[PDB]
Design a binder for this molecule. Structure first.
Ligand SMILES: [Zn+2]
Length: 140
């Protein structure tokens, strides 16, 4: 579990969005596993605007933050998980590291701020849904 809070937006894994998220929907994209809902309070997080490929992510199934190198966001085949069938996920970054389903929502951060959230795992990789392209998270 976990979310990003920026401005009056909450960014969550689409597959973990609640009824309240859907009832306050701003934007969602199944291909990316992302959903954004509106908040009443202002968020604590800063979104990175960069092409960093090094950062640190939170792994809840280890109670640990790990430094990782990760690939640039791309269209990647993901094997079946507890929450999605095998499919192509867009805007996905991969790193070598531990990730189980419940690790979804852990933040990946670089020197500039939040890069994305854990979205995939298995076979010794962790996948992150990028958010650095979503410039609108900082306005309106
Ligand atoms: Zn960065």
């Amino acid at each position: 579990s976990g979310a990003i809070y920026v401005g009056n937006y909450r960014v969550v894994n689409r597959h973990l969005a609640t009824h309240n998220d859907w009832a306050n929907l701003v934007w969602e994209d199944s291909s990316r596993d992302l959903l954004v809902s509106s908040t009443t309070a202002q968020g604590c997080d800063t979104i990175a605007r960069c092409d960093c490929q090094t950062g640190v992510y939170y792994c809840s199934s280890r109670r640990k933050h790990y430094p990782v190198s990760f690939s640039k966001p791309s269209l990647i085949f993901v094997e079946a998980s507890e929450y999605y069938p095998a499919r192509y996920q867009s805007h996905l970054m991969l790193a070598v590291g531990h990730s189980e389903p419940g690790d979804c929502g852990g933040i990946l951060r670089c020197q500039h701020g939040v890069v994305g959230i854990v979205s995939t795992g298995g076979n010794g990789l962790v996948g992150f849904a990028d958010v650095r392209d979503l410039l609108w998270l900082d306005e309106e």
